[PDB]
Symmetry: C2
């Protein structure tokens, strides 16, 4: 693939991920995405034959990015547990885990294409490794399951409905600090 | 209003609140609601002239219920702080605060009719009273604002997207325990 075609494809993907964080998910059309990416509809469609394909290419890209954050965190963890644990969660939270998952998840995780499903499995495996490190270093209570942590992180990261949103987002940003505190001290 | 007309109106409201907890919010029509409530469309519409009116009547009912839970909790708090604090939050969580708010909130809280807006104000005032009691009894860290607590509670109560939902909902139910723990120990 020509270098410029590959850069253009990557830009369409990045643009789409950003749109999912700033725009109503149901308001976006292929035409809208092409326009925001600064490419023609035909260029968009040659890369991604349909909406599902574009959305799955976005999933694939995001899983690849999450895996690199997990691998950085796993390798760095032993010599800065609290620092790595905190920065890892801050990064997923601030980068929209909570907008991107609902934007891109199909009704069943079984509908993910096989390459994406493989990435999901690696992500779940790395999460267990990370949680086990966190438990080792007293950062996450031992009774908390890895799946509970994941679902919780996705849940607390979902931005509030418009009516409850603030310009600072302080109420929302504070929720991450409280979730990590809860994970550490365990359930009340 | 005849006793039987008033009971019928209350049943349409309860049915609608339950549907919002079990059904896709965008999938519901006035016709669907009338059918699930066991009433005719014309009976439904004489009570509630349009969807907004029905949804606002539901909001009004729910705010009235939340206010009674707040008043029970405020009066009972001093002689069982942890017990009252926990049961109050368990009850809003288990009764779908997290499904009902997004189902019923308009884009701006300014769009609430005046009787509903008054109920919202009383609810916010009672929440401050409750939080101040909780802080007094060491259940909520003193730095946490009442609005942060509300937004957090609404956020953690929002059920997960289908793909991440489990039959037990244990991952989800555990999130409440972790949120209260975080509130108590304060931010990490």
């Amino acid at each position: 693939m020509r270098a410029d075609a590959l850069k253009r494809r990557e830009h369409i993907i990045t643009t789409t991920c950003n749109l999912y964080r700033t725009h109503h998910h149901d308001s976006l059309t292929m035409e809208n995405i092409a326009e925001q990416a600064g490419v023609g509809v035909a260029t968009l469609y040659r890369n991604f034959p349909d909406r599902f394909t574009l959305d799955m290419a976005c999933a694939q890209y995001l899983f690849n990015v999450v895996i690199s954050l997990q691998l950085q965190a796993i390798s760095t963890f032993p010599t800065d547990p609290e620092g790595v644990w905190t920065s890892f969660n801050q990064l997923l939270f601030d980068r929209g885990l909570g907008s991107l998952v609902p934007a891109l998840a199909p009704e069943s995780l079984d509908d993910l294409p096989d390459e994406v499903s493989a990435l999901r499995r690696t992500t779940e495996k790395n999460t267990t490794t990370l949680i086990n490190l966190a438990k080792q270093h007293g950062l996450v209570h031992h009774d908390i399951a890895p799946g509970t942590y994941i679902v919780g992180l996705i849940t607390i990261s979902r931005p509030p409905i418009t009516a409850l949103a603030t310009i600072s987002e302080n109420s929302h940003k504070a929720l991450l600090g409280l979730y990590l505190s809860g994970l550490k001290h365990g359930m009340m």
